[PDB]
Amino acid sequence: ASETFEFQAEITQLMSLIINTVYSNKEIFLRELISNASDALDKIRYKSLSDPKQLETEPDLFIRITPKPEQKVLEIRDSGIGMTKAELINNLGTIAKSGTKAFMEALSAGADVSMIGQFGVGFYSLFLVADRVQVISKSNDDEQYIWESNAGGSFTVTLDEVNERIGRGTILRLFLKDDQLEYLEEKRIKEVIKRHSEFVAYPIQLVVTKEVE
Ligand SMILES: CO[C@H]1[C@@H](OC)C[C@H](C)[C@@H](OC)C2=CC(=O)C=C(NC(=O)/C(C)=C/C=C\[C@H](C)[C@@H](OC(N)=O)/C(C)=C/[C@@H]1C)C2=O
After folding, report:
1. Which end of the chain is more exposed for a tag (fewer CB within 10 A), N or C?
2. Cα 36 to averaged position of ligand 1 atoms, centre (Å)
3. 175 by DSSP, 3-state: which?
4. Of 21, 20, 160, which is closest to residue 88 (Cα–Cα)?
5. Computed from CA positions of residues 109, 115, 121, 126, in that sequence, does the dihedral angle turn out positive or negative?
6. 83 CA to middle of ligand 1, Å?
7. Atom 15 of ligand 1: nearest residue by CA position
8. Rounded to a whole number, what is the largest CA-CA distance in the chain?
9. Which residue in 207, 164, 187 sits closest to 65, CA to CA?
10. Which of 37, 28, 16 is nearest to 168 (CA)?
11. At which positions is ATP bound?
């Protein structure tokens, strides 16, 4: 069964601002998701310094981006620390975030949307280009779970019996809007990566599908 949770009020406001923003430079969403992926990789690697066994569920540390054109989906995967069920629930919606209201105020005063990561709330930049999102996550401390939001006032958390096992880490599965399908293109993804994520400690893999000729 799927469990349903209410978003904290300000987080619902933020999603609503972001999903209904005409604004330019939407490409910044990729920088933010790569940064989070990199943060999740830092954590597992730092944890592993004193607990090497933690790496064993997925010994390769990578960031991997997979266009799925038929579904109009873009997936960004990392083999970082992952999140437990309680973490998905608490950290992705139910609990007020320090920077939510401050960012919205900054935006309202003229701040660049790309400042979002500096307010600690950059995950929500995915709504720039997606109308729906699944966060699929496996922490060493829990089962694999699916968190899901359509920017509306509630999200669901479901035990994952439908997706590939990840050994450890997270997949952000972005259901792209019809006007943002450009982010399925290899050439476009490489440009955005090379522009705004030059200094990343982990390999960034692009999964490309090609008809044999
Ligand atoms: C143990 O740290 C967790 C996370 O706690 C559950 C840490 C915090 C949410 C916070 O630490 C200060 C943030 C750490 C970050 O690096 C980025 C953030 N910005 C966000 O917009 C949010 C809400 C990200 C949340 C989950 C995200 C999909 C994550 O992205 C992944 N896992 O790829 C994420 C950064 C999860 C990390 C690994 C944080 O809050």
Report:
1. C
2. 6
3. strand
4. 160
5. positive
6. 9
7. 36
8. 54
9. 207
10. 37
11. 32, 36, 78, 83, 91, 97-99, 118-123, 170
Type of residue found at 154: S
- Integer angstrom CA distances of residue 76 from 32, 36, 145: 11, 10, 16
Taking CA atoms only, the protein residue closest to ligand 1 atom 30 is 36
Taking the C-alpha atoms of residue 168 and residue 201, their distance in angstroms, rounded to an integer, is 18
| Count of residues making up the chain | 213
How many Å apart are CA 38 and CA 80, to the nearest integer? 8
Task: Please give the resolution of this entry in Å, rounded to 1 decimal.
Answer: 2.4
Q: How far apart are CA 44 and CA 52, in angstroms?
A: 10
Ligand 1 center–CA 207 separation, angstroms: 24
Q: How was this structure determined?
A: X-ray
Phi-psi label, residue 90: left if phi above 0, alpha if psi -120 to 50, beta otherwise: alpha
For residue 196, give the amino acid letter: H
> CATH topology for 1-213?
Heat Shock Protein 90 (3.30.565)
Strand pairing class (63-68; 204-206): parallel
